[PDB]
Design a protein around this motif. Structure first.
Motif, PDB file in Angstrom:
ATOM      1  N   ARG A  37       0.614  -1.114  -0.040  1.00 21.00           N
ATOM      2  CA  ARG A  37      -0.129  -0.168  -0.117  1.00 21.00           C
ATOM      3  C   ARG A  37       0.903   1.253   0.009  1.00 21.00           C
ATOM      4  O   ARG A  37       0.539   2.367   0.838  1.00 21.00           O
ATOM      5  N   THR A  38       1.918   1.388  -0.963  1.00 20.12           N
ATOM      6  CA  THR A  38       2.713   2.347  -0.932  1.00 20.12           C
ATOM      7  C   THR A  38       2.063   3.788  -0.944  1.00 20.12           C
ATOM      8  O   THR A  38       1.167   3.672  -1.657  1.00 20.12           O
ATOM      9  N   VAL A  39       2.445   4.583  -0.065  1.00 22.15           N
ATOM     10  CA  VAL A  39       1.888   5.991  -0.129  1.00 22.15           C
ATOM     11  C   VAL A  39       2.491   7.040  -1.282  1.00 22.15           C
ATOM     12  O   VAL A  39       3.535   7.393  -1.197  1.00 22.15           O
ATOM     13  N   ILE A  40       1.520   7.650  -2.041  1.00 18.76           N
ATOM     14  CA  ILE A  40       1.875   8.463  -3.030  1.00 18.76           C
ATOM     15  C   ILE A  40       1.708  10.067  -2.478  1.00 18.76           C
ATOM     16  O   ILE A  40       2.661  11.031  -2.366  1.00 18.76           O
ATOM     17  N   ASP A  41       0.662  10.168  -2.053  1.00 17.90           N
ATOM     18  CA  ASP A  41       0.342  11.654  -1.423  1.00 17.90           C
ATOM     19  C   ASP A  41      -0.605  11.478  -0.145  1.00 17.90           C
ATOM     20  O   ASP A  41      -1.588  10.436  -0.040  1.00 17.90           O
ATOM     21  N   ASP A  42      -0.310  12.031   0.963  1.00 19.70           N
ATOM     22  CA  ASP A  42      -1.250  11.941   2.148  1.00 19.70           C
ATOM     23  C   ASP A  42      -1.272  13.713   2.581  1.00 19.70           C
ATOM     24  O   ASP A  42      -0.351  14.220   2.729  1.00 19.70           O
ATOM     25  N   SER A  43      -2.467  13.949   2.485  1.00 19.46           N
ATOM     26  CA  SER A  43      -2.825  15.407   2.965  1.00 19.46           C
ATOM     27  C   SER A  43      -2.432  15.640   4.305  1.00 19.46           C
ATOM     28  O   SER A  43      -1.615  16.768   4.379  1.00 19.46           O
ATOM     29  N   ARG A  44      -2.912  14.873   5.299  1.00 24.57           N
ATOM     30  CA  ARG A  44      -2.585  15.107   6.344  1.00 24.57           C
ATOM     31  C   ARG A  44      -0.906  15.544   6.654  1.00 24.57           C
ATOM     32  O   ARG A  44      -0.454  16.122   7.448  1.00 24.57           O
ATOM     33  N   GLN A  45      -0.085  14.449   6.054  1.00 24.82           N
ATOM     34  CA  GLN A  45       1.298  14.439   6.371  1.00 24.82           C
ATOM     35  C   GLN A  45       1.740  15.792   6.234  1.00 24.82           C
ATOM     36  O   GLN A  45       2.725  16.460   6.827  1.00 24.82           O
ATOM     37  N   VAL A  46       1.367  16.737   5.157  1.00 28.45           N
ATOM     38  CA  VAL A  46       1.848  17.987   4.712  1.00 28.45           C
ATOM     39  C   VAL A  46       0.996  18.996   5.755  1.00 28.45           C
ATOM     40  O   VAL A  46       1.354  20.162   5.578  1.00 28.45           O
TER      41      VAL A  46
END
Ligand SMILES: C/C=C(/C)CC/C=C(\C)CCC=C(C)C
Length: 150
Positions: A37-46
């Motif tokens: 489930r590799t992460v490309i974009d994570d809103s919260r992370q930013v």
């Protein structure tokens, strides 16, 4: 079709008023259908959550189709077929630019962007490029936060 939905956390109420001009506020995570489930974009992370406005309730963007199917505080997962993800890299590159203040429509940014891609054949991020040269389905985890109206 081309899109299975799974509610992971049920929402508070009946469907909102996804009227044209609605401000829809949400968090999202984008992942390959990796085992990992590799992460490309994570809103919260930013940090900040994502904001959109419904363009036309009668002609909806793919993301509007997902969003408007949701309730406040619903956390739902959307597996989206390859036929819907060919545009995700370019959409992502514009989000990342927005995340750094740069406005991907302003003149200097948009021109610098085109120049950079014309010259070096790259969206500006290694992962988006790998994703572009290797189509595949994607999963989006969306946390519908708030809905406002015009
Ligand atoms: C660049 C112009 C926009 C209007 C951005 C709209 C696109 C998004 C906010 C991406 C979220 C999409 C998912 C399927 C989670």
């Amino acid at each position: 079709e081309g899109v299975k939905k799974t509610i992971l956390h049920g929402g508070t109420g009946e469907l909102p008023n996804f009227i044209t001009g609605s401000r829809v506020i949400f968090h999202f995570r984008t992942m390959k259908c990796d085992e990992e489930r590799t992460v490309i974009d994570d809103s919260r992370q930013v940090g900040q959550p994502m904001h959109i406005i419904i363009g036309n309730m009668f002609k909806l963007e793919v993301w509007e189709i997902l969003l408007t199917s949701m309730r406040v505080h619903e956390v739902a997962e959307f597996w989206c077929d390859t036929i819907h993800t060919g545009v995700y890299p370019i959409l992502s590159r514009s989000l990342r630019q927005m995340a750094q203040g740069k406005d991907p429509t302003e003149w200097h940014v948009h021109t610098c962007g085109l120049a950079n891609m014309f010259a070096y054949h790259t969206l500006g991020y290694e992962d988006l490029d790998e994703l572009q040269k290797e189509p595949q389905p994607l999963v989006f985890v969306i946390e519908l936060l708030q809905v406002d109206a015009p």
